[PDB]
Amino acid sequence: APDSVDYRKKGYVTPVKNQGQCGSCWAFSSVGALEGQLKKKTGKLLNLSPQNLVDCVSENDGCGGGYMTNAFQYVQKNRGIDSEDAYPYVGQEESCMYNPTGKAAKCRGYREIPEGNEKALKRAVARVGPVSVAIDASLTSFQFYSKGVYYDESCNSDNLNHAVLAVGYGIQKGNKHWIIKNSWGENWGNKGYILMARNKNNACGIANLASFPKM
Ligand SMILES: *[C@H](CS(=O)(=O)c1ccccc1)[C@H](CCc1ccccc1)NC(=O)[C@H](CC(C)C)NC(=O)N1CCNCC1
Secondary structure (H helix, E strand, O other): OOOOEEOOOOOOOOOOOEOOOOOOHHHHHHHHHHHHHHHHHHOOOOOEOHHHHHHHOOOOOHHHOOOHHHHHHHHHHHOOEEEOOOOOOOOOOOOOOOOHHHEEEOOOOEEEOOOOOHHHHHHHHHHOOOEEEEEOOOOHHHHOOOOOEEOOOOOOOOOOOEEEEEEEEEEEOOEEEEEEEOOEOOOOOEOOEEEEEOOOOOHHHOOOOOEEEOO
16 A cells, blocks of 8 residues: 555545534444545545434434444445435434435445554555544543644543544654544534544554445
């Protein structure tokens, strides 16, 4: 794999979104991975709907949390997920109202990266595209990130509480990092993005719960 990859530059990443008050980070992480695969499969980049996921993935808890794998499974069993336009994000769990007519993509499975293996996560990003990842984002230093490659010794790799999207990797002034797309708006971090330390012993547990869908 190359030494630096940035899918934003390749048009595989949609604009940064904001989950609002609803803790649906898992839904945004899921749609972001699906949008990357859609782009790779059809050459078209579209906003997929996180709300379709928060309302319809019964195995998950809506705004109270969930997992990306359950979301991928639902998309595969449902044989589709709507575009954002066809199922607008409201920021609160409502009854499942999937509109088969607004379907924009589908899913045919997902793969999980070996737990804690950052080398394998790198290969995956290089070969498939944006990968959904889970991290510990509970530290004040994460909330107030600005500038540089984020690294904090308090980060706990067994305390995963946030779901984000790895859209690439590289090295900034000697520091290896993962380019991460968050879902807290463009106003947070560096225009909605954060660079996280790569190869610093699975910092914040970045390679502990990584997955991507198959199309
Ligand atoms: C999303 C994380 S977040 O942006 O809300 C957040 C805010 C500030 C700091 C850190 C994270 C989401 C939050 C769920 C939640 C809401 C309210 C109170 C407690 C939890 N986290 C998840 O959905 C998370 C995803 C990864 C895979 C760990 N999963 C999750 O929280 N759950 C709990 C319920 N059972 C399923 C998994």
